[PDB]
Swiss-Prot record, chain B:
Note: The capsids of autonomous parvoviruses expose a proportion of VP2 N-terminus and part of that sequence can be cleaved of to form VP3.
Protein name as it appears in the record: Capsid protein VP1
Entry remark concerning the domains of this protein: The N-terminus of VP1 is sequestered within the mature capsid. It contains a phospholipase A2-like region and putative nuclear localization signals.
Organism: Murine minute virus (strain MVM prototype) (MVM)
Family: Belongs to the parvoviridae capsid protein family.
Transmembrane segments: none
Subcellular localization(s) per the UniProt record: Virion; Host nucleus
Function description: Capsid protein self-assembles to form an icosahedral capsid with a T=1 symmetry, about 22 nm in diameter, and consisting of 60 copies of two size variants of the capsid proteins, VP1 and VP2, which differ by the presence of an N-terminal extension in the minor protein VP1. The capsid encapsulates the genomic ssDNA. Capsid proteins are responsible for the attachment to host cell receptors. This attachment induces virion internalization predominantly through clathrin-dependent endocytosis.
């Protein structure tokens, strides 16, 4: 029927402690998605080419030239942390838990209403009459077999809103068509020419045009219809909610000290380096903390700010996130920078068109690399080394002075042991489909829970076409009565977490909410203002430390 | 390492009217795919709206 509701709003999160320190977190989310009719209902590829930034000398990193198949379908993708958990729940599943894992996910569309707009004047100027529509349909094809390209909407910050008392927008589905880009590298104001800014014609081998109709089984939802996807059972690996602090110089037994401090100020001197035990990798006859043999290297030196280029233009190599260490290098360790919009945790009172940005400093303190205080000596170790026997971070590589050896040094070896980066709160991304390549990467720098078998189904929604009486299937104008609709979406994401074991003597670090002021954790942020302007800023994911080795 | 074929293998002397047959060796390999990939690093994920 039309005058009856086919669902129930539910948004709370349930903790269901199920024995020996195992929690069953069952996060429920529900929003009111606002579907509008597409711009055009034709599939069209639009090549984007910016010869206003890229033609300037030295702007290879300012290049976003590509090609995209633009489907007339909108995508309901709840793949962020802020959709499911409220900010008081990322404080309970960070201070108290020690390990999180994904269990299942089931989604549901109900309370669909579609309505058209008409024009009337009433004052000499046209106003809208929002007339109801009881026979129009909504098409809700979910893609559970993963034939279409995977476009996670947490990349363009286009997921559902994080506040449950707001209507959200559905993000339009579009994917990448494969054309060739050829850009020449150029430094700043070089006396020359660009000489290569060509975009290629479609190749015959790697061309994939994917229609949603010929691949999916579409359900036509009317006003009194509901849709439900079955529980997709995850097969991911657990991330830990405890950060590591032990660097490579704090692994193993510390050296035994011969003298002890009398007062509480001075330090205890160790055994002298000449008559000291242990193993080293060098040939010198003294053991120190620096040249001592350790089980494994903890953080690897990655070549930072390098731009590779292969058949699609220059792109930056993705760095594994790491800690900035006291000389702070937010780019040399790969600290991710966010550009989230106004329905994803910006201050609503921000009148400006610019987004709010946040550089995510990684909490794993052990695997971090101070780039300015690293060096390379000669193969026979002499201490102290001469001028031509050490490669510091002040010598130039090549002709250019600003490129030192830490930009080209890739020290990822067969005994590099690092932790995978933390789940970023609200504007993170929960899962990601593993790539279909024959040899897979070790991690994804966009999602903690890489699905081992199959990704959950992309839910693609659009409005069925409403036509006027004047219609020609030959060369037409596509009149198409102005329709829109709103539908409720409800998802349930089940999680499973393990509680903490208090082993230390001192109090551990906790994400406490401080008083109002200039601190980062003032309670005035997670609280609506006098006109109701919420903001959601990121929270620390791994407060408590753990022992690496 | 000096490896003689005589001291390591069991040799079959085939005459004119003799045959030899090895049993079915069962492979334990991994499947390669006969579909090539085209997506580079600048064509992964959702394109910008």
């Amino acid at each position: 029927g039309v005058g009856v509701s086919t669902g129930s709003y539910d948004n709370q999160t349930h903790y269901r402690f199920l024995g020996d320190g195992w929690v069953e977190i069952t996060a429920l989310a529900t929003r009111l998605v606002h579907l509008n009719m597409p711009k055009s209902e034709n599939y069209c590829r639009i090549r984007v080419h910016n010869t206003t930034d890229t033609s300037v000398k030295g702007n290879m990193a300012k290049d976003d030239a590509h090609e995209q198949i633009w489907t007339p379908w909108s995508l309901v993708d709840a793949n962020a942390w802020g959709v499911w958990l409220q900010p008081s729940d990322w404080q309970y599943i960070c201070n108290t838990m020690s390990q999180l894992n994904l269990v299942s996910l089931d989604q549901e569309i109900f309370n669909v209403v579609l309505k058209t707009v008409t024009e009337q004047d009433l004052g000499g100027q046209a106003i809208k009459i929002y007339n109801n529509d009881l026979t129009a349909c909504m098409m809700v094809a979910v893609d559970s077999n993963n034939i279409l390209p995977y476009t996670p909407a947490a990349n363009s910050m286009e997921t559902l809103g994080f506040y449950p008392w707001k209507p959200t927008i559905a993000s339009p589905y579009r994917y990448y068509f494969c054309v060739d880009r050829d850009l020449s590298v150029t430094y700043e104001n070089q006396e020359g020419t660009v000489e290569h800014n060509v975009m290629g014609t479609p190749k015959g081998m790697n061309s994939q045009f994917f229609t949603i109709e010929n691949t999916q089984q579409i359900t036509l939802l009317r006003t009194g219809d509901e849709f439900a996807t079955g529980t997709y059972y995850f097969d991911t690996n657990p991330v830990k909610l405890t950060h590591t602090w032990q660097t490579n110089r704090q692994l193993g037994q510390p050296p035994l000290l011969s003298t002890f401090p009398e007062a509480d100020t001075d330090a205890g001197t160790l055994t002298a380096q000449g008559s000291r035990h242990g193993t080293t990798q060098m040939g010198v006859n003294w053991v120190s903390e620096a040249i001592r043999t350790r089980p494994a290297q903890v953080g690897f030196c990655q070549p930072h700010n390098d731009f590779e280029a292969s058949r699609a233009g220059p792109f930056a190599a993705p760095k594994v996130p790491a800690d900035i260490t006291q000389g702070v290098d937010k780019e040399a360790n790969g600290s991710v920078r966010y550009s989230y919009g106004k329905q994803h945790g910006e201050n609503w009172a921000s009148h400006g068109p610019a987004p709010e940005r946040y550089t995510w400093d990684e909490t794993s303190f052990g695997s971090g690399r101070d780039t300015k205080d690293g060096f390379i000596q000669s193969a026979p170790l002499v201490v102290p080394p001469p001028l031509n026997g050490i490669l510091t971070n002040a010598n130039p590589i090549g002709t250019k002075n600003d490129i030192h050896f830490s930009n080209v040094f890739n020290s990822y070896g067969p005994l590099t042991a690092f932790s995978h980066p933390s789940p970023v709160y609200p504007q993170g991304q929960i899962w990601d489909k593993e790539l279909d390549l024959e040899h897979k990467p070790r991690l994804h720098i966009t999602a903690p829970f890489v699905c081992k078998n199959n990704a959950p189904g992309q839910m693609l929604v659009r409005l069925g076409p409403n036509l006027t009486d004047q219609y020609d299937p030959n060369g037409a104008t596509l009149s198409r009565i102005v329709t829109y609709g709103t539908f409720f979406w409800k998802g349930k994401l089940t999680m499973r977490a393990k509680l903490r074991a208090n082993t230390t003597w001192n109090p551990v670090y906790q994400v406490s909410a401080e008083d109002n002021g200039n601190s980062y954790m003032s309670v005035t942020k997670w609280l609506p203002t006098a006109t109701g302007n919420m903001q959601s800023v990121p929270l620390i994911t791994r407060p408590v430390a753990r022992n690496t080795y």
